[PDB]
Amino acid sequence: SLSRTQIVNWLTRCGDIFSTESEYLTGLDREIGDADHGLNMNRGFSKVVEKLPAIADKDIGFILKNTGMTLLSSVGGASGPLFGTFFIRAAQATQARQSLTLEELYQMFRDGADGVISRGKAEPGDKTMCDVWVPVVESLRQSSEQNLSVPVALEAASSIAESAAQSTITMQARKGRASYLGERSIGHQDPGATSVMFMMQMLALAAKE
Ligand SMILES: Nc1ncnc2c1ncn2[C@@H]1O[C@H](COP(=O)(O)OP(=O)(O)O)[C@@H](O)[C@H]1O
Ligand SMILES: [Mg+2]
Ligand SMILES: [Mg+2]
């Protein structure tokens, strides 16, 4: 099972990673966008994390939804609404729970991903966060098929996140500001996708035995 407080620990670690990797993520976004993604993500999660002390004892749905809206209101640019939607849609799917099964994490990732895909309309291979979300979702699905423990599922999901992020360097952007570069977006890792990768690495850690 994955505990509410592990989830709080996730968001905490996301706060850290988005602080530490601001520069790097903004690097990625210079190459193929307006050089703001690390600024955007740090702003958002630093807000997310400042809020944890007040909300940390409410239920998982409450924390994710509230996180969702912070991101929604605070990240800005194109990713903000997408990460927001992810968490908000992840929230519902979480009946006021307090821990989570592998199966409920899958479903919550599944719905979060559907939300981002239906919102921003990216297809696999377009070079966006979705190129990480989809395989991560798919990992959780098979990990759930095999009834692995949450921690090992999450660690598997995590290294797939790494591969999937890596695999975007080669894709040409069909979506968002990076598409403005056309063929010049090939050869560069997507920022958004790197962020999802960061979130999943912190999730793996938060949940570590
Ligand atoms: N449908 C989408 N449209 C635009 N960006 C998307 C979409 N889906 C995912 N993304 C992500 O948004 C990221 C850029 O976010 P960010 O730099 O913070 O916003 P902006 O490009 O508006 O400055 C891209 O790297 C990409 O991963
Ligand atoms: Mg940008
Ligand atoms: Mg922007």
Swiss-Prot record:
GO biological process, one term: carbohydrate phosphorylation
MF terms in GO: ADP binding; ATP binding; glycerone kinase activity; magnesium ion binding; phosphoenolpyruvate-glycerone phosphotransferase activity
InterPro entries reported for this sequence: DhaK_L_YcgS (IPR012737), DhaL_dom (IPR004007), DhaL_dom_sf (IPR036117), Dihydroxyacetone_Kinase (IPR050861)
Keyword Metal-binding: yes
Keyword terms, alphabetized: ATP-binding, Cytoplasm, Glycerol metabolism, Kinase, Magnesium, Metal-binding, Nucleotide-binding, Transferase
Coiled-coil regions listed: none
Cofactor dependency: Mg(2+)
Enzyme category, top tier: transferase
Pfam families per the UniProt record, alphabetical: Dak2 (PF02734)
Sequence positions that bind Mg(2+): 29, 34, 36
Upregulating conditions: Activated by DhaR.
Subcellular location: Cytoplasm
Catalytic activity: dihydroxyacetone + phosphoenolpyruvate = dihydroxyacetone phosphate + pyruvate
Pathway annotation from the record: Polyol metabolism; glycerol degradation
Function per UniProt: ADP-binding subunit of the dihydroxyacetone kinase, which is responsible for the phosphoenolpyruvate (PEP)-dependent phosphorylation of dihydroxyacetone. DhaL-ADP is converted to DhaL-ATP via a phosphoryl group transfer from DhaM and transmits it to dihydroxyacetone bound to DhaK. DhaL also acts as coactivator of the transcription activator DhaR by binding to the sensor domain of DhaR. In the presence of dihydroxyacetone, DhaL-ADP displaces DhaK and stimulates DhaR activity. In the absence of dihydroxyacetone, DhaL-ADP is converted by the PTS to DhaL-ATP, which does not bind to DhaR.
Quaternary data: Homodimer. The dihydroxyacetone kinase complex is composed of a homodimer of DhaM, a homodimer of DhaK and the subunit DhaL. DhaL also forms a complex with DhaR.
Additional remarks: Unlike the carbohydrate-specific transporters of the PTS, the complex DhaKML has no transport activity. The tightly bound ADP participates in a double displacement phosphoryl transfer reaction and thus plays the same role as histidines, cysteines and aspartic acids in other phosphoprotein intermediates.
The name this protein goes by in its record: PEP-dependent dihydroxyacetone kinase, ADP-binding subunit DhaL
Species this protein is from: Escherichia coli (strain K12)
